[PDB]
Amino acid sequence: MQGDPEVIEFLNEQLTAELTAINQYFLHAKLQDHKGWTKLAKYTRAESFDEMRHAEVLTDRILLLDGLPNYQRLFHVRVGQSVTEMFQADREVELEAIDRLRRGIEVMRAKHDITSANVFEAILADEEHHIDYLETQLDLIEKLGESLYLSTVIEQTQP
Amino acid sequence: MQGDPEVIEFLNEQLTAELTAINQYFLHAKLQDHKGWTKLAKYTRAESFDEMRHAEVLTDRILLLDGLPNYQRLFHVRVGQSVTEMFQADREVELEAIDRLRRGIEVMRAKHDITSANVFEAILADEEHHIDYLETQLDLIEKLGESLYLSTVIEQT
Amino acid sequence: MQGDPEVIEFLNEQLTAELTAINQYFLHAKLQDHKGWTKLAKYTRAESFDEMRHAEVLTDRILLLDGLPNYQRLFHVRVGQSVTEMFQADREVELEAIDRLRRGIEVMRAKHDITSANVFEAILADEEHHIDYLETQLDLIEKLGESLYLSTVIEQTQ
Amino acid sequence: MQGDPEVIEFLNEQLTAELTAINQYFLHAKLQDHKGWTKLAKYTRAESFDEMRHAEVLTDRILLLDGLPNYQRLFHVRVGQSVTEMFQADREVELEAIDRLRRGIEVMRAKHDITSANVFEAILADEEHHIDYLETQLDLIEKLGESLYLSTVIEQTQ
Amino acid sequence: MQGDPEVIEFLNEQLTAELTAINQYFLHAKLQDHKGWTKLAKYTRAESFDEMRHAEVLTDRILLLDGLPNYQRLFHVRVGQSVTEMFQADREVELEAIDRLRRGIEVMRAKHDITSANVFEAILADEEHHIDYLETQLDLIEKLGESLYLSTVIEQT
Amino acid sequence: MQGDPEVIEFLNEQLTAELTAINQYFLHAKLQDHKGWTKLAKYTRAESFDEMRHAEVLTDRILLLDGLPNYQRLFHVRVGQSVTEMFQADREVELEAIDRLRRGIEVMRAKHDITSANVFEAILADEEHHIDYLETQLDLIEKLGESLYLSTVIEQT
Ligand code: HEM
Ligand code: HEM
Ligand code: HEM
Ligand SMILES: [Fe+2]
Ligand SMILES: [Fe+2]
Ligand SMILES: [Fe+2]
Ligand SMILES: [Fe+2]
Ligand SMILES: [Fe+2]
Ligand SMILES: [Fe+2]
């Protein structure tokens, strides 16, 4: 029982998205943490653990197909300065992952595995359920205005 | 005992208001749910369930009068895009109900049954307790301003 | 992402089945309770709310596809007088559900969305459990006889 | 210490009755479950596991006599469609077991083992305790009539 | 609504795998029960009930398709003497199941049922989650050695 | 108050060791997880999370110095096949971190900050409490021999 290496690569190209998404959420989480924009920092910190949960079940599956996880390669990572830029860039990153997950399942359905597609749809169902929130968030600032939007995301701590 | 048919349609035209008001509340409750306006979405879900409670006690009464509920015919339903139009539209819907309910009871009390008028006033007492609320709500946006009014209706959760 | 309207209308014609099924279940639930037929009216009221919430998970899907729910148009609704007629009627109503749902998902799997079809099977799996039950119930009346079948559906509770 | 192969086979001929009886009870338990005949399906599922508890202690016993359990051969299994003949069919299956077990224990007492026939009587006290019950059941249908007898075993589900 | 017989037989040949695997797991569990290798027999008894859980949901499906379960005929069942042979033979039995499951779901997906394939994948997901553990165990012995592998399976209790 | 840039890369070259260390632990932890080498797999998962506790306060330090964390580039990561190779490889990785931590604090004390060096010693106390343990582990195999050493790592559960 050996996985077809393209299907393995179809798993593997998903994996490079995982490691980059860990750091770009977490540093931005640590970015706003100094910036005091408090409740949104609580969101992306709790969000980042789900991709840790997303990546681990990915990691087991290729071992069931007797694969070799490359944790060495990486994609390019970006940073922003205001949150709109932070909300615009990762959208493309979330726009990046879907089509790869889209194009993977149609071909892997043609090649007789069922179980790895069940992994692939499940993570794909998360991100479409994820990206809309950002799409909800951005204009909700943008129609309203950033300053009053900034005026509600902060609070003084409990010393 | 047989229900008088004139009273029966007076119950019935109220029922047509009920089913239409269910959907126009609920979809607009689901509309702001996507639009992140969290707290009023909790409120509009709470308003919809009372009309669901309003309709069932309406429903059994005509069966006591041995009637046939038309759950088939409806009235025209509208939608809005900002909240103010939604607050303007349902006002007319609330303006639609009361005067017709005002029309029914006097004619009903003229014809010797008491019991459905008790249902009439009880359902009237809610909407007169309801129509003023949005009437207070809309000017409170309008005097103040919509953008800051939007600045308190959301929640990141 | 914008939903393809052929998927959207196929979501939409499911919705028209949903609203009509609410009223025909509930009124017939409000039929037999006056008729004393108690536990099936408990069952029919219990049958309503699952079919209710089936439409809500239908509803929230199409706004992700940026759609406009027609909560205005309906299908034709029927009533009966004895329960056998009701059990014959809703069978056809459930007979209308599956094949159209069967007609959809093949095309939906043919057109590069997966996520909506998971709802499509999920609403299907319920009515698989539903249509046989009423199919079971009718022969129980028919092999036995209606009168003794009425002789177990009523209690002294009012 | 080695078991005498006749006694082993006489233990073994019980075992063929065991696995056959498990399926013929369980499918009928699943049959009336689809047929809605509720409490008998509760009773048939409950009666089946005692036979599962029956067969396992037989399986250890031949290992104590250092035997080889044939889990391969099976006797012929039947099925019906009405409820009555199922009570007639298993009666013969109940009639099949006892006399052969009656044939054994005399020979078991004839040949200097005590312990295996203790299992034989322990299972035989069960098989008498079944055959009377179904015999009590069937005439109670038969004197009364099937339809009113059927008119008490179905009840609604949750 | 009637089940298609080619779908039905595909359920049916799966069923023959069930009853054979029940006895071969259970007796070999009862084999090491004499042989004092208790913790794997604890593993074997708990594993055997899950196939009994797999078999009943197989059974109720076909009567929804209005089918007739053949609980009558079976396939050939084997026995071993050391555990490696027991680990080698059931692997083939697990190798027997999955391709037949692979052969079924491709065809019935072309033939307009969805629901029984959901049953088929669910048991198929178990066996691929099963057969690796067999494959994990057997190489772990022969790399290490059998006698020390025997040196960890008794309990004296 | 601005961080002196020489301090910043000396924080940063520690950081490049950090992200590489998590994966080489975890994948090898996931390697033995398939291999049934479970009790040390429990240990290696515990080793991963402490490094996350080490790396975060490192990241919190540099923003006080107004720094830019390069989470982008890495160092070279290796894999092994038997545990001795794994215990030999990470030893060098443990040997890699200390001298950089050693060469830091002499300069960190030399240039009028204490607080970053307080982090620098606090991380350094961990690996000296760590590299001895793995050094103890490998020789404990080495006198003994791998097979009997492996013969206690299996749980069968
Ligand atoms: C101060 C707290 C934490 C920090 C700074 C942190 C940070 C990180 C980072 C940077 C990664 C990516 C490294 C990698 O993927 O190998 C990661 C992965 C992970 N962490 Fe955390 N984490 C924290 C809390 C936790 C806790 C408390 C747990 C478990 C009880 C946990 C479980 C995991 C898991 C399962 C992964 C995925 C492993 C992997 O994909 O390689 N994390 N964490
Ligand atoms: C003709 C009468 C009614 C109609 C048309 C109606 C309609 C609905 C609808 C559309 C939903 C959304 C479910 C979904 O999206 O899946 C719902 C939910 C619900 N229904 Fe009704 N309803 C009616 C009467 C009632 C009444 C009077 C009650 C209870 C006293 C009730 C019990 C419920 C409850 C409790 C929920 C909320 C379930 C939840 O929050 O999880 N229904 N109903
Ligand atoms: C929730 C509890 C149980 C379930 C779902 C279950 C399931 C089943 C079913 C349905 C069968 C019949 C299949 C057939 O023979 O065609 C079976 C066979 C069997 N049952 Fe169970 N059973 C349960 C309890 C038990 C227990 C607790 C034991 C033993 C301690 C047991 C012992 C057996 C044996 C040994 C067989 C195989 C018969 C043979 O090899 O001849 N059962 N199992
Ligand atoms: Fe993901
Ligand atoms: Fe009302
Ligand atoms: Fe439904
Ligand atoms: Fe027995
Ligand atoms: Fe299975
Ligand atoms: Fe560290």
mmCIF file with all atom_site columns, all heavy atoms in Angstrom, chain E residues 112-129:
data_model
loop_
_atom_site.group_PDB
_atom_site.id
_atom_site.type_symbol
_atom_site.label_atom_id
_atom_site.label_alt_id
_atom_site.label_comp_id
_atom_site.label_asym_id
_atom_site.label_entity_id
_atom_site.label_seq_id
_atom_site.pdbx_PDB_ins_code
_atom_site.Cartn_x
_atom_site.Cartn_y
_atom_site.Cartn_z
_atom_site.occupancy
_atom_site.B_iso_or_equiv
_atom_site.pdbx_formal_charge
_atom_site.auth_seq_id
_atom_site.auth_comp_id
_atom_site.auth_asym_id
_atom_site.auth_atom_id
_atom_site.pdbx_PDB_model_num
ATOM 1   N N   . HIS E 1 112 ? -26.229 6.192  -8.552  1.00 0.00 ? 112 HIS E N   1
ATOM 2   C CA  . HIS E 1 112 ? -27.313 7.021  -8.029  1.00 0.00 ? 112 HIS E CA  1
ATOM 3   C C   . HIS E 1 112 ? -27.754 6.690  -6.613  1.00 0.00 ? 112 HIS E C   1
ATOM 4   O O   . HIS E 1 112 ? -28.762 7.233  -6.156  1.00 0.00 ? 112 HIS E O   1
ATOM 5   C CB  . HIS E 1 112 ? -28.531 6.975  -8.954  1.00 0.00 ? 112 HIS E CB  1
ATOM 6   C CG  . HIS E 1 112 ? -28.175 7.050  -10.402 1.00 0.00 ? 112 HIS E CG  1
ATOM 7   N ND1 . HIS E 1 112 ? -28.127 5.938  -11.212 1.00 0.00 ? 112 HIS E ND1 1
ATOM 8   C CD2 . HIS E 1 112 ? -27.791 8.094  -11.171 1.00 0.00 ? 112 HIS E CD2 1
ATOM 9   C CE1 . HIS E 1 112 ? -27.755 6.297  -12.426 1.00 0.00 ? 112 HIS E CE1 1
ATOM 10  N NE2 . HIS E 1 112 ? -27.547 7.601  -12.429 1.00 0.00 ? 112 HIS E NE2 1
ATOM 11  N N   . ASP E 1 113 ? -27.063 5.819  -5.896  1.00 0.00 ? 113 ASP E N   1
ATOM 12  C CA  . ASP E 1 113 ? -27.194 5.771  -4.450  1.00 0.00 ? 113 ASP E CA  1
ATOM 13  C C   . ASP E 1 113 ? -25.966 6.444  -3.873  1.00 0.00 ? 113 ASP E C   1
ATOM 14  O O   . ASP E 1 113 ? -24.858 6.269  -4.389  1.00 0.00 ? 113 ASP E O   1
ATOM 15  C CB  . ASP E 1 113 ? -27.308 4.351  -3.902  1.00 0.00 ? 113 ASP E CB  1
ATOM 16  C CG  . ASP E 1 113 ? -27.050 4.295  -2.399  1.00 0.00 ? 113 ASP E CG  1
ATOM 17  O OD1 . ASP E 1 113 ? -27.963 4.646  -1.623  1.00 0.00 ? 113 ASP E OD1 1
ATOM 18  O OD2 . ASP E 1 113 ? -25.921 3.965  -1.989  1.00 0.00 ? 113 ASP E OD2 1
ATOM 19  N N   . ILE E 1 114 ? -26.160 7.209  -2.818  1.00 0.00 ? 114 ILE E N   1
ATOM 20  C CA  . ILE E 1 114 ? -25.067 7.780  -2.060  1.00 0.00 ? 114 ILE E CA  1
ATOM 21  C C   . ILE E 1 114 ? -24.892 7.056  -0.733  1.00 0.00 ? 114 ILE E C   1
ATOM 22  O O   . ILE E 1 114 ? -23.774 6.897  -0.242  1.00 0.00 ? 114 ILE E O   1
ATOM 23  C CB  . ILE E 1 114 ? -25.290 9.294  -1.852  1.00 0.00 ? 114 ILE E CB  1
ATOM 24  C CG1 . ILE E 1 114 ? -25.588 9.979  -3.189  1.00 0.00 ? 114 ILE E CG1 1
ATOM 25  C CG2 . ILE E 1 114 ? -24.077 9.955  -1.219  1.00 0.00 ? 114 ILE E CG2 1
ATOM 26  C CD1 . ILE E 1 114 ? -24.568 9.706  -4.297  1.00 0.00 ? 114 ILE E CD1 1
ATOM 27  N N   . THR E 1 115 ? -25.985 6.530  -0.186  1.00 0.00 ? 115 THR E N   1
ATOM 28  C CA  . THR E 1 115 ? -26.034 6.255  1.243   1.00 0.00 ? 115 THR E CA  1
ATOM 29  C C   . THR E 1 115 ? -25.264 4.996  1.616   1.00 0.00 ? 115 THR E C   1
ATOM 30  O O   . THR E 1 115 ? -24.587 4.962  2.650   1.00 0.00 ? 115 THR E O   1
ATOM 31  C CB  . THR E 1 115 ? -27.484 6.153  1.689   1.00 0.00 ? 115 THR E CB  1
ATOM 32  O OG1 . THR E 1 115 ? -28.245 7.180  1.045   1.00 0.00 ? 115 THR E OG1 1
ATOM 33  C CG2 . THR E 1 115 ? -27.578 6.322  3.185   1.00 0.00 ? 115 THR E CG2 1
ATOM 34  N N   . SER E 1 116 ? -25.338 3.960  0.785   1.00 0.00 ? 116 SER E N   1
ATOM 35  C CA  . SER E 1 116 ? -24.660 2.713  1.122   1.00 0.00 ? 116 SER E CA  1
ATOM 36  C C   . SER E 1 116 ? -23.158 2.823  0.921   1.00 0.00 ? 116 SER E C   1
ATOM 37  O O   . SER E 1 116 ? -22.385 2.071  1.527   1.00 0.00 ? 116 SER E O   1
ATOM 38  C CB  . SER E 1 116 ? -25.233 1.569  0.295   1.00 0.00 ? 116 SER E CB  1
ATOM 39  O OG  . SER E 1 116 ? -25.427 1.972  -1.042  1.00 0.00 ? 116 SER E OG  1
ATOM 40  N N   . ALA E 1 117 ? -22.722 3.748  0.067   1.00 0.00 ? 117 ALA E N   1
ATOM 41  C CA  . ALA E 1 117 ? -21.293 3.991  -0.069  1.00 0.00 ? 117 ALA E CA  1
ATOM 42  C C   . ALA E 1 117 ? -20.742 4.648  1.183   1.00 0.00 ? 117 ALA E C   1
ATOM 43  O O   . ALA E 1 117 ? -19.582 4.425  1.550   1.00 0.00 ? 117 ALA E O   1
ATOM 44  C CB  . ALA E 1 117 ? -21.022 4.854  -1.297  1.00 0.00 ? 117 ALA E CB  1
ATOM 45  N N   . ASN E 1 118 ? -21.572 5.451  1.858   1.00 0.00 ? 118 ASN E N   1
ATOM 46  C CA  . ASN E 1 118 ? -21.180 6.039  3.131   1.00 0.00 ? 118 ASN E CA  1
ATOM 47  C C   . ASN E 1 118 ? -21.005 4.967  4.190   1.00 0.00 ? 118 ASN E C   1
ATOM 48  O O   . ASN E 1 118 ? -20.167 5.096  5.087   1.00 0.00 ? 118 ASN E O   1
ATOM 49  C CB  . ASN E 1 118 ? -22.213 7.064  3.580   1.00 0.00 ? 118 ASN E CB  1
ATOM 50  C CG  . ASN E 1 118 ? -22.650 7.967  2.459   1.00 0.00 ? 118 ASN E CG  1
ATOM 51  O OD1 . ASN E 1 118 ? -21.887 8.236  1.535   1.00 0.00 ? 118 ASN E OD1 1
ATOM 52  N ND2 . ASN E 1 118 ? -23.878 8.453  2.537   1.00 0.00 ? 118 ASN E ND2 1
ATOM 53  N N   . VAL E 1 119 ? -21.787 3.898  4.099   1.00 0.00 ? 119 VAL E N   1
ATOM 54  C CA  . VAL E 1 119 ? -21.540 2.742  4.946   1.00 0.00 ? 119 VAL E CA  1
ATOM 55  C C   . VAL E 1 119 ? -20.236 2.076  4.542   1.00 0.00 ? 119 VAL E C   1
ATOM 56  O O   . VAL E 1 119 ? -19.434 1.674  5.392   1.00 0.00 ? 119 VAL E O   1
ATOM 57  C CB  . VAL E 1 119 ? -22.723 1.766  4.864   1.00 0.00 ? 119 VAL E CB  1
ATOM 58  C CG1 . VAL E 1 119 ? -22.639 0.746  5.978   1.00 0.00 ? 119 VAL E CG1 1
ATOM 59  C CG2 . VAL E 1 119 ? -24.031 2.530  4.922   1.00 0.00 ? 119 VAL E CG2 1
ATOM 60  N N   . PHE E 1 120 ? -19.994 1.986  3.233   1.00 0.00 ? 120 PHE E N   1
ATOM 61  C CA  . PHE E 1 120 ? -18.838 1.250  2.738   1.00 0.00 ? 120 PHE E CA  1
ATOM 62  C C   . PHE E 1 120 ? -17.534 1.940  3.059   1.00 0.00 ? 120 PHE E C   1
ATOM 63  O O   . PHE E 1 120 ? -16.536 1.272  3.332   1.00 0.00 ? 120 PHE E O   1
ATOM 64  C CB  . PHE E 1 120 ? -18.932 1.051  1.239   1.00 0.00 ? 120 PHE E CB  1
ATOM 65  C CG  . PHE E 1 120 ? -19.732 -0.125 0.836   1.00 0.00 ? 120 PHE E CG  1
ATOM 66  C CD1 . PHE E 1 120 ? -19.975 -0.358 -0.488  1.00 0.00 ? 120 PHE E CD1 1
ATOM 67  C CD2 . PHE E 1 120 ? -20.176 -1.050 1.766   1.00 0.00 ? 120 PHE E CD2 1
ATOM 68  C CE1 . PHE E 1 120 ? -20.696 -1.462 -0.894  1.00 0.00 ? 120 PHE E CE1 1
ATOM 69  C CE2 . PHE E 1 120 ? -20.903 -2.158 1.371   1.00 0.00 ? 120 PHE E CE2 1
ATOM 70  C CZ  . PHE E 1 120 ? -21.159 -2.365 0.032   1.00 0.00 ? 120 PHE E CZ  1
ATOM 71  N N   . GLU E 1 121 ? -17.506 3.265  2.996   1.00 0.00 ? 121 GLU E N   1
ATOM 72  C CA  . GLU E 1 121 ? -16.276 3.969  3.319   1.00 0.00 ? 121 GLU E CA  1
ATOM 73  C C   . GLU E 1 121 ? -16.002 3.901  4.810   1.00 0.00 ? 121 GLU E C   1
ATOM 74  O O   . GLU E 1 121 ? -14.845 3.929  5.245   1.00 0.00 ? 121 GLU E O   1
ATOM 75  C CB  . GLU E 1 121 ? -16.354 5.421  2.845   1.00 0.00 ? 121 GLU E CB  1
ATOM 76  C CG  . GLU E 1 121 ? -17.541 6.249  3.347   1.00 0.00 ? 121 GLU E CG  1
ATOM 77  C CD  . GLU E 1 121 ? -17.329 6.873  4.724   1.00 0.00 ? 121 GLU E CD  1
ATOM 78  O OE1 . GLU E 1 121 ? -16.163 6.972  5.160   1.00 0.00 ? 121 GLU E OE1 1
ATOM 79  O OE2 . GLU E 1 121 ? -18.322 7.258  5.374   1.00 0.00 ? 121 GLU E OE2 1
ATOM 80  N N   . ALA E 1 122 ? -17.069 3.838  5.609   1.00 0.00 ? 122 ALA E N   1
ATOM 81  C CA  . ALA E 1 122 ? -16.927 3.923  7.053   1.00 0.00 ? 122 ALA E CA  1
ATOM 82  C C   . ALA E 1 122 ? -16.255 2.676  7.594   1.00 0.00 ? 122 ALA E C   1
ATOM 83  O O   . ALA E 1 122 ? -15.372 2.755  8.451   1.00 0.00 ? 122 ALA E O   1
ATOM 84  C CB  . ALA E 1 122 ? -18.294 4.128  7.698   1.00 0.00 ? 122 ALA E CB  1
ATOM 85  N N   . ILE E 1 123 ? -16.619 1.518  7.051   1.00 0.00 ? 123 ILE E N   1
ATOM 86  C CA  . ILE E 1 123 ? -15.939 0.292  7.436   1.00 0.00 ? 123 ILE E CA  1
ATOM 87  C C   . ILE E 1 123 ? -14.578 0.213  6.766   1.00 0.00 ? 123 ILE E C   1
ATOM 88  O O   . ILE E 1 123 ? -13.634 -0.361 7.321   1.00 0.00 ? 123 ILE E O   1
ATOM 89  C CB  . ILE E 1 123 ? -16.808 -0.931 7.103   1.00 0.00 ? 123 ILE E CB  1
ATOM 90  C CG1 . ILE E 1 123 ? -17.363 -0.820 5.687   1.00 0.00 ? 123 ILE E CG1 1
ATOM 91  C CG2 . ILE E 1 123 ? -17.933 -1.070 8.104   1.00 0.00 ? 123 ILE E CG2 1
ATOM 92  C CD1 . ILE E 1 123 ? -17.822 -2.126 5.113   1.00 0.00 ? 123 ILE E CD1 1
ATOM 93  N N   . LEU E 1 124 ? -14.451 0.798  5.572   1.00 0.00 ? 124 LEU E N   1
ATOM 94  C CA  . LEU E 1 124 ? -13.174 0.786  4.872   1.00 0.00 ? 124 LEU E CA  1
ATOM 95  C C   . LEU E 1 124 ? -12.149 1.640  5.599   1.00 0.00 ? 124 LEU E C   1
ATOM 96  O O   . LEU E 1 124 ? -10.956 1.318  5.611   1.00 0.00 ? 124 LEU E O   1
ATOM 97  C CB  . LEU E 1 124 ? -13.356 1.277  3.438   1.00 0.00 ? 124 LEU E CB  1
ATOM 98  C CG  . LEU E 1 124 ? -12.189 1.175  2.457   1.00 0.00 ? 124 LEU E CG  1
ATOM 99  C CD1 . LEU E 1 124 ? -11.459 -0.145 2.584   1.00 0.00 ? 124 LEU E CD1 1
ATOM 100 C CD2 . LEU E 1 124 ? -12.687 1.380  1.037   1.00 0.00 ? 124 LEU E CD2 1
ATOM 101 N N   . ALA E 1 125 ? -12.606 2.720  6.234   1.00 0.00 ? 125 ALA E N   1
ATOM 102 C CA  . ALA E 1 125 ? -11.711 3.571  7.007   1.00 0.00 ? 125 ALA E CA  1
ATOM 103 C C   . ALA E 1 125 ? -11.203 2.850  8.245   1.00 0.00 ? 125 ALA E C   1
ATOM 104 O O   . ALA E 1 125 ? -10.118 3.145  8.752   1.00 0.00 ? 125 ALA E O   1
ATOM 105 C CB  . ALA E 1 125 ? -12.426 4.862  7.395   1.00 0.00 ? 125 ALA E CB  1
ATOM 106 N N   . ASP E 1 126 ? -11.979 1.892  8.747   1.00 0.00 ? 126 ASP E N   1
ATOM 107 C CA  . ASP E 1 126 ? -11.546 1.142  9.917   1.00 0.00 ? 126 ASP E CA  1
ATOM 108 C C   . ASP E 1 126 ? -10.441 0.164  9.557   1.00 0.00 ? 126 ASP E C   1
ATOM 109 O O   . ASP E 1 126 ? -9.475  -0.003 10.309  1.00 0.00 ? 126 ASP E O   1
ATOM 110 C CB  . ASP E 1 126 ? -12.736 0.409  10.524  1.00 0.00 ? 126 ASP E CB  1
ATOM 111 C CG  . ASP E 1 126 ? -13.925 1.307  10.712  1.00 0.00 ? 126 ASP E CG  1
ATOM 112 O OD1 . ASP E 1 126 ? -13.722 2.526  10.894  1.00 0.00 ? 126 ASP E OD1 1
ATOM 113 O OD2 . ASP E 1 126 ? -15.065 0.811  10.649  1.00 0.00 ? 126 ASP E OD2 1
ATOM 114 N N   . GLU E 1 127 ? -10.560 -0.481 8.398   1.00 0.00 ? 127 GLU E N   1
ATOM 115 C CA  . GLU E 1 127 ? -9.664  -1.586 8.087   1.00 0.00 ? 127 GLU E CA  1
ATOM 116 C C   . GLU E 1 127 ? -8.291  -1.086 7.674   1.00 0.00 ? 127 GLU E C   1
ATOM 117 O O   . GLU E 1 127 ? -7.275  -1.720 7.980   1.00 0.00 ? 127 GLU E O   1
ATOM 118 C CB  . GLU E 1 127 ? -10.269 -2.465 6.995   1.00 0.00 ? 127 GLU E CB  1
ATOM 119 C CG  . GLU E 1 127 ? -11.678 -2.955 7.295   1.00 0.00 ? 127 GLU E CG  1
ATOM 120 C CD  . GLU E 1 127 ? -11.897 -3.322 8.756   1.00 0.00 ? 127 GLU E CD  1
ATOM 121 O OE1 . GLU E 1 127 ? -11.222 -4.246 9.257   1.00 0.00 ? 127 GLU E OE1 1
ATOM 122 O OE2 . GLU E 1 127 ? -12.760 -2.691 9.399   1.00 0.00 ? 127 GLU E OE2 1
ATOM 123 N N   . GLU E 1 128 ? -8.235  0.052  6.983   1.00 0.00 ? 128 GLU E N   1
ATOM 124 C CA  . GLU E 1 128 ? -6.945  0.676  6.724   1.00 0.00 ? 128 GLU E CA  1
ATOM 125 C C   . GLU E 1 128 ? -6.345  1.198  8.020   1.00 0.00 ? 128 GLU E C   1
ATOM 126 O O   . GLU E 1 128 ? -5.123  1.203  8.199   1.00 0.00 ? 128 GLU E O   1
ATOM 127 C CB  . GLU E 1 128 ? -7.091  1.789  5.687   1.00 0.00 ? 128 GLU E CB  1
ATOM 128 C CG  . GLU E 1 128 ? -8.120  2.865  6.004   1.00 0.00 ? 128 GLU E CG  1
ATOM 129 C CD  . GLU E 1 128 ? -7.534  4.017  6.788   1.00 0.00 ? 128 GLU E CD  1
ATOM 130 O OE1 . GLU E 1 128 ? -6.291  4.107  6.862   1.00 0.00 ? 128 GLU E OE1 1
ATOM 131 O OE2 . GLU E 1 128 ? -8.306  4.818  7.349   1.00 0.00 ? 128 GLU E OE2 1
ATOM 132 N N   . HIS E 1 129 ? -7.203  1.605  8.954   1.00 0.00 ? 129 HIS E N   1
ATOM 133 C CA  . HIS E 1 129 ? -6.744  1.951  10.290  1.00 0.00 ? 129 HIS E CA  1
ATOM 134 C C   . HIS E 1 129 ? -6.430  0.698  11.089  1.00 0.00 ? 129 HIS E C   1
ATOM 135 O O   . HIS E 1 129 ? -5.828  0.762  12.165  1.00 0.00 ? 129 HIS E O   1
ATOM 136 C CB  . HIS E 1 129 ? -7.806  2.784  10.997  1.00 0.00 ? 129 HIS E CB  1
ATOM 137 C CG  . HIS E 1 129 ? -7.247  3.813  11.922  1.00 0.00 ? 129 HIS E CG  1
ATOM 138 N ND1 . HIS E 1 129 ? -7.117  5.136  11.564  1.00 0.00 ? 129 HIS E ND1 1
ATOM 139 C CD2 . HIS E 1 129 ? -6.783  3.718  13.189  1.00 0.00 ? 129 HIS E CD2 1
ATOM 140 C CE1 . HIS E 1 129 ? -6.599  5.813  12.573  1.00 0.00 ? 129 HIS E CE1 1
ATOM 141 N NE2 . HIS E 1 129 ? -6.387  4.976  13.571  1.00 0.00 ? 129 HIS E NE2 1
#
